[PDB]
Design a protein around this ligand. Structure first.
Ligand code: CL
Ligand code: NA
Lengths: 306, 301
């Protein structure tokens, strides 16, 4: 029992973190096989930030303009190329600690672990979700650019996020490992702002099922709802629409607990109406939305505490 | 910016986790140098656990009663002994991945990272605190015994917790790596319960400082207080007494933010007395107490 924000063990990613320096700028890179991946804005100087032309900035660089440091070892750069907003530096040494890995682009609502790094050295690990507005609510200080997000289901590291920048509200924007931003954001320091964010409804429902699995039912009620009536209510609280895909995804948790998905929807509607009246759910006084259905199955017992 | 519950990177510990089997019981062990550490209750049957004589059960056991598996490699057990509630299995091979490490017993209110493991395989990492009642609010399923908690200082891992049991309220109890329990608990199937818990005041204050550093200021007020007056309030609300040492430890955050600890205590005093008024602090509707002053400084600075 218990329920925690649970990250993946970070060691497989720790062994891939390096420091990349260009000019006066230092940030983190990801060393897989003989390639180091990092944000292309490492090649920007002070002036360059408003309207950089990365093609023009990059053509002026030689391989030896890139300093890559793996712990105490200088790695020799022997080639470079840009893919979208990621710089790829070919180095003369394949990383002997390279895990089994793949690159995946995720959808809003998906979760992942972040290994926050500074100067190529890992500092801490935490869980994040891709918000509906394509930002993440990270914890990142100056120098964290190039830190990555990942999952490790079944001994393979799926890299899904590389950190590029902070927006004015203090949330974070970045790319997949092919260098394509999540959301409409760009690696320019022109004014940009996260949209109005919303609550990830399918994840709240998953976490309510987690609460039932762990033995608590106080928030259920005798009612049900249609999917459309649920969405009409939930959107008034700035919840994301629940789709039939989401309903299908929740099937296994519904089966394990014996609570129909639309009956859990009725419970959620009532929680939004009533609050918790001084109670908590899995240790929280608010409805939590950064655990996915898959996360709940990963962490919770397959046997409900009835 | 931002503020997250954050664990230490777990790689140095992942390289130390192994599977230990005795009879039909499988759990996790910690492999450092040429010794594997695990809960001594690995040697017990379910019958034994009602009233185990660990001395007698262990003298019955021999090296060949233990199967230690590091990934796919079997480690040969060449000795065995007990230290308090921890079993020590000498193996013929020193762990080449052994980090610089110490065994450190922590105090209530201090935090640590937990590497949750099953069948010797790391599964997840999370952060938690030693509660004032010496339990931890972990997340553990059957097979997690022997999972460890730790902190890192530079390159040195300070191991502070090994997981032994779940209590009836679903919180968890265990030992330091020398086998000494945290809290008034024993490794036998007998009636046991978590005592009434209290909130870790110095950590709540630390988290209020973190909230200020991150731009959450609505709870600040013009008032200050004294230790004596605040501690009468803390007692009322089942908060741990605030000591002068706690005030001193918070000094840095006091200097950085301009809110003296007794100034922030006046905020906390008011939050206890009046509630949050529908507002949140750092995205929480509760007062969070599992961030230490060190944790805040490390993450914010
Ligand atoms: Cl996805
Ligand atoms: Na004040």
């Amino acid at each position: 029992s218990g329920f925690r924000k649970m990250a993946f063990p970070s060691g497989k990613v720790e062994g891939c973190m390096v420091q990349v320096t260009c000019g006066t700028t230092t940030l983190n890179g990801l060393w897989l096989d003989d390639v180091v991946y990092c944000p292309r804005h490492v090649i920007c100087t002070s002036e360059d930030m408003l309207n950089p032309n990365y093609e023009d900035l990059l053509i002026r660089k030689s391989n030896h303009n890139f300093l890559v440091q793996a712990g105490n070892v200088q790695l020799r750069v022997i080639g470079h190329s840009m893919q979208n907003c990621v710089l790829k530096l070919k180095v003369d040494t394949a990383n002997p600690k390279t895990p089994k890995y793949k690159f995946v682009r995720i959808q809003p609502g998906q979760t992942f672990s972040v290994l926050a790094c500074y100067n190529g050295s890992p500092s801490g690990v935490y869980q994040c979700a891709m918000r509906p507005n394509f930002t993440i609510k990270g914890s990142f200080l100056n120098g964290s650019c190039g830190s990555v997000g990942f999952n490790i289901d079944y001994d393979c590291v799926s890299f899904c996020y590389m950190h590029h920048m902070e927006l004015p509200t203090g949330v974070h924007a970045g790319t997949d490992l092919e260098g394509n931003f999540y959301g409409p954001f760009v690696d320019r320091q022109t004014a940009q702002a996260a949209g109005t964010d919303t609550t990830i409804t399918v994840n709240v429902l998953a976490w309510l099922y987690a609460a039932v699995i762990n033995g608590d039912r106080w928030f259920l009620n005798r009612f049900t709802t249609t999917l459309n009536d649920f969405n009409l209510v939930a959107m008034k609280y700035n919840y994301e629409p629940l789709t039939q895909d989401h309903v299908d995804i929740l099937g296994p948790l519904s089966a394990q607990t014996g609570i129909a998905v639309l009956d859990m929807c009725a419970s959620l509607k009532e929680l939004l109406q009533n609050g918790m009246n001084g109670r908590t759910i899995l240790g929280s006084a608010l409805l939590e939305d950064e655990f996915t259905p898959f996360d709940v199955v990963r962490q919770c017992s397959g046997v409900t505490f009835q």
